[PDB]
């Protein structure tokens, strides 16, 4: 498969799974499915790529289905970025 070109959207309020992880449920809005979801976590400084993405190689099968992505965010403020470019969705998350 290949990286996904288009935009994404969040389908549900992010939930804490409390094995230490957080799940993000996202929908693919552009074209080129199936494809890989371009996702990365960012620091409080909003530039360096910290943390880790649990779900091994998340896949957007189609434009209707929701991709479930588990991840390990650092305590406090973190920025989750889904997709590429300026229509990259950016989620300011806070871990307690």
């Amino acid at each position, epitope marked *: 498969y290949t990286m996904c070109s288009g*935009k994404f*959207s969040i389908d*549900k*309020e992010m939930a804490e799974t409390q094995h230490g992880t957080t799940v993000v*449920k996202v929908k693919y809005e552009g074209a080129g499915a199936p494809c890989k979801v371009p996702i990365e976590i960012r620091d409080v400084n909003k530039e360096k790529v910290v943390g880790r993405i649990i779900s091994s190689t998340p896949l957007a099968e189609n434009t*209707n289905s929701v991709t479930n992505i588990e991840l390990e965010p650092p305590f406090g403020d973190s*920025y989750i970025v889904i997709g590429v470019g300026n229509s990259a969705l*950016t*989620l300011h998350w806070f871990r307690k």
Partner: single-chain antibody
């Protein structure tokens, strides 16, 4: 291609209860299923939303106690039960899906009965502009509508006897297929929808909507018309 099919239009006596079904072509477990009512010639009123994964139901305070929203994740069907019906409740009952705007809607079910709190302010109530000319509709929320660093403000178009159409979501993001001439700006509390060049297709009612925290209140609507 449409993913929501609703039950047939029911006629009920005052004081009765009604149950509307909504069958989805996708897995409702990973989704926010909402119900929206629309009285004849009045605006859109959000009723509530269910998370079918955990059955979590949040309702609108207007209807609180009268509505019961359920979901069967096995049959990917969502339900809505409304009790102690008044002639008042005669409306079209829409079944919808999504968080950053309701991208997916049902055909509607006409129910005919016969024998934190936020204020969303849409301006104007109606307006006429000439073809090809620029048109602007505004929405002002009483509180903040940001969440996760994004403004959860959406815009809908609704032509008569038709379900609404999500146009703009996440304040500025344009839904797939929507013409270039449509645009959304704004932040914090003031947002605006703008049609750079008015086309005859655009004559419709427009609704703005918040979705960051419940209720997912709609604006009162803006009837857009042609001059001359």
């Amino acid at each position: 291609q449409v993913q929501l099919v609703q039950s047939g239009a029911e006629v009920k006596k005052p004081g009765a209860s009604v149950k509307v079904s909504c069958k989805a072509g996708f897995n409702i477990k990973d989704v926010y299923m909402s119900w929206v009512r629309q009285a004849p010639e009045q605006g859109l009123e959000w009723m509530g939303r269910i998370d079918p994964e955990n059955g979590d139901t949040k309702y609108d305070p207007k209807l609180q106690g009268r509505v019961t929203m359920t979901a069967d994740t096995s049959t990917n069907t969502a339900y809505m039960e409304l009790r102690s019906l008044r002639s008042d409740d005669t409306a079209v009952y829409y079944c919808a899906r999504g968080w950053e705007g309701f991208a997916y809607w049902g055909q509607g079910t006409l129910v005919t009965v016969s024998s934190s709190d936020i204020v969303m302010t849409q301006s104007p109530a109606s307006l006429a502009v000439s073809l090809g000319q620029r048109a602007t509709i505004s929405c002002r929320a009483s509180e903040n509508v940001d969440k996760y660093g994004n403004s959860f403000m959406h815009w809908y178009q609704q032509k008569p006897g038709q379900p609404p159409k999500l146009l703009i979501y996440r304040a500025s993001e344009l839904q797939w297929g929507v013409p270039d001439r449509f645009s959304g700006s704004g932040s914090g509390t003031d947002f605006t929808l703008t049609i750079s060049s008015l086309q005859a297709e655009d004559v419709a009612v427009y609704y703005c909507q918040r979705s960051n925290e419940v209720p997912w209140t709609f604006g009162q609507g803006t009837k857009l018309e042609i001059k001359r």
